[model samples]
Target: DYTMVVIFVIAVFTVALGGYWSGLVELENLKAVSPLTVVIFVVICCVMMVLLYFFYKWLVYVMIAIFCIASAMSLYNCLAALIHKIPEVRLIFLSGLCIAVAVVWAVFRNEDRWAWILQDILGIAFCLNLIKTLKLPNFKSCVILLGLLLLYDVFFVFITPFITNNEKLPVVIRVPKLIYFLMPVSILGFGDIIVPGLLIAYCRRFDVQTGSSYIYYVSSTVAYAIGMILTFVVLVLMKKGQPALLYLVPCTLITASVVAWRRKEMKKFWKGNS
Candidate 1:
């Protein structure tokens, strides 16, 4: 109950702040549209929110579909911008197309049909866009990155299947356990690969020599290397019937130790020269 209250408070605050920006300040219009269009967009978002409040379970699938489409369009635009020098405005337009499709589908379709179409469109678009973006030269770093990701996925998907099969675990335990297992993998992809890749690509495009760019590049590379090493170690330990050691103790210990060391190093480096 306390946790629920805190979450509700945060959600209310976020929504209120977003409303102030979008409606009163008309920040949405800063993208590429008129204030009238921004007002219409806010109205549509509010109506969708109201509907989602009433039919959340059905809305979840629709939200997922919209997220899938938006993510696909964004990645496609990113790679296209890199290779063909497509304008950022074009990317915004593509994202608008996705939003329009999602709004239309969610508003008109029945729940069952909506879920089916959402899944189909999301899955197909996600896969196609992923492949297309990855085919771009700037996007394709090296085969080693793919190999590391493949190995990480293999362990993550296959090794943990039985752990999730246990029916006796409470929802609380199950949820946190799943998060614990998945969080590292998420960090590797988002923190190590995607964020750094975007930074490098942007820097190259603009020819900015910001010293922080080098720091980000180094940090990202180090994170990927660490993730790869830890992934392999965990895989080997799991294969040796040491799953508990791999999952429980070593993961926690290694993560903490590395973070602590990095913190200390960063402080020393920042203060020593200054």
Candidate 2:
């Protein structure tokens, strides 16, 4: 009960910081749109997920094919980014290095340095696939699953630090920081996106089923973005890794709950038959 209040207090702080940072960030950054590639691919995979849902045998082959294709594309980009940094390198050498990295990676995929890139790529594809395939039957289930995962997230990040004596487990998506050598990569956990994302996806289907004009979907998604922005701020502010769901679960659930409650649709929303 008290935890919920504190969560909202932080939620308000997050919303303020979100708007402030949004304004401070330049519009020109939109020109890159490189990140849109991931969006496009993930959307494609979701479509594929729906199409392949009933085809158990075919799904296995497609998943393997997707794993191979996605990993290859990512590996190419990884090398391209490294070599392109100099801008003086020619395309032929770039092409050659691609094969070299691919050959080396395929043969010795377990090596720590080489594996991280592959792990990040595979992990992302895996999470997106899971989110697309898994369905929660109702809001009740969403609450139950997210609530349990929330405690698990908090426990692992908060409590386990003292017990484990080292802060490392599980997979994460990593993008190299561009500023300098030995630069730390920016990492986002698979669960950070997927767990709350499950709720967002549920909101999406709820809108579709009820024909509610996408109000629930849009609101919950905005809440998710805000929650993530808050996670970013706190991580920077405290200079420590945070359990992202500490912020995400509250923002998403509260937003979803308030939207339903205010609309007087909590009956259908809670039972999820609408």
Candidate 3:
């Protein structure tokens, strides 16, 4: 019972972190664009995927470069502090110099551990912020938010343009959904996972009637696993990013709602949401 319970958190997080790219090395030759710029420009491009007939374009090669380099260095420096036991002033010259060359090499070499390692650190930061900032009070609240977001995702992804140029159908974007931590954590937005994960978390907080309800929890967990499976199925069939919540919300909501209805606990489940 508790074993499957832990699976909900792990499943969503697993799929969410399951990122891959086809033609990353090609990006180096495309332009002076940093891996970070690849993230930003691609996201702005995603707006077009939402707007096809109505959107804009451009470049900010410099700041994009600066931002990408700094983000990588910050994480690398943190790792440096732990690994080399460096100090503040040491971060400037000694530490900075060491990682600078590392960063340059890390970019050129595929599968640089720092690239993946830094993303792991940033993903933790992202997780912590969402935990503190989200205020999902009850089951009903989580349901509504995810439902709306699901429609928002499906419509934008299905109706609008594609996230990539598709001129020659380049094999890789290497950019993530929102931010890049030396690489991508998303293909569109971190909110794709954050929003649903919060609701999943909300299920864990079902402390109202009868103190707690594992039935509601179990139903939604199975639902989310199903949802993630279907979402990727659509991605594979459609050959691009589909709004993940499009599949996620319905699976989770319907399962939980049905469980509540059968248990005659819908009222209690939604109690605080009122």
Candidate 4:
């Protein structure tokens, strides 16, 4: 179980590191525009989930293809932008190799180390893209989405436990462990990263808009990390699967609230991109 902690720490920090990069990329592209309202966003998520649950057998095929394509694109762009120290000519070959690996991953998905690594890589790329692309209009929108997702996470993880068991969506980081006779260790949902990540991204944008330092951005990101550790602590003590957003939402929300209040930016923050 303690190895689970190692894996968890790795995954958490990986997300933190990648998410910071995601925000930077978002800033560079200037793409963080608010389009979807909170209500409509949540509505689409709920509806998609219902459809996914029922049509999962067929959807899995589609999801795998979608994920592979998205992963390949992100991986290509990430390499092209971030790592130019190497010769550019070889990137095409590397991209081809990456695509081949993705196809192999799609064809023979397994729980081995390489498979888990690919899954984690794909999940991060997917989540980072979403974080950069999606925007919450204002503080109220963040609150609404975060709050609603909090309940949704608890309902699905906890309440749904009474109803059934099933396969997890590939939108999570998964690591393998031998402690429990060779099974998947701890898992961190993309929602835990993405929802809070979107808020953190908002804070960064706010910092940009206000010509301030990364006050809310830094504080909220730190709060998210702390909240994730708290989730692990509770997980260890309770010896159960916990809905991470239960801890994360409050931590991030409260930190941003306190920061805004202290800086006398509460009104501005609540008013959107002010």
- Give per-candidate clash totals: 0, 0, 4, 0
Expressed as tens digits, the lDDT of each residue in 1-274 for candidate 4 is 6655665565455456555665575565554463356568778888988888789888877776888898877766666665675544678887997788677777656546567877877677667667766766688888888888898987778767688614445666777664653465567777887888888878877776676476777788789888888988898799788888999999999999999999888998998854
Q: Which ten residues in a row have the lowest lDDT in candidate 2?
A: 19-28
Local error of candidate 4 at residue 144 (angstroms):
1.4
Minimum summed lDDT over a 10-residue window in model 3 is located at 17-26
User: What are the per-residue Cα lDDT tens digits for candidate 2 across 84-192?
Assistant: 6675347666656545644554455435554556555455444544454466767887887788778767766876679661113224555555344244456666677
TM-score against truth, every candidate: 0.29, 0.58, 0.51, 0.84
Q: Sorted on lDDT, highest at the top, how do the candidates line up? A: 4, 2, 3, 1
- Candidate 3: give its CA RMSD in angstroms: 13.8
Assess candidate 2 and give its lDDT: 0.60
Clashes of 4: 0
Off by over 4 Å in 2: 1-117, 164-170
Tell me which residue pairs clash in candidate 2: none
For candidate 3, lDDT tens digit of each residue in 44-115?
A: 756744563443122333323443454454445334535464335755665566456445533533454344
Find the candidate with the highest lDDT and give its number.
4
Greater lDDT among 2 and 4 belongs to 4
Where does candidate 4 stray beyond 4 Å? 2-4, 22-37, 84-91, 111-113, 164-168, 178-181
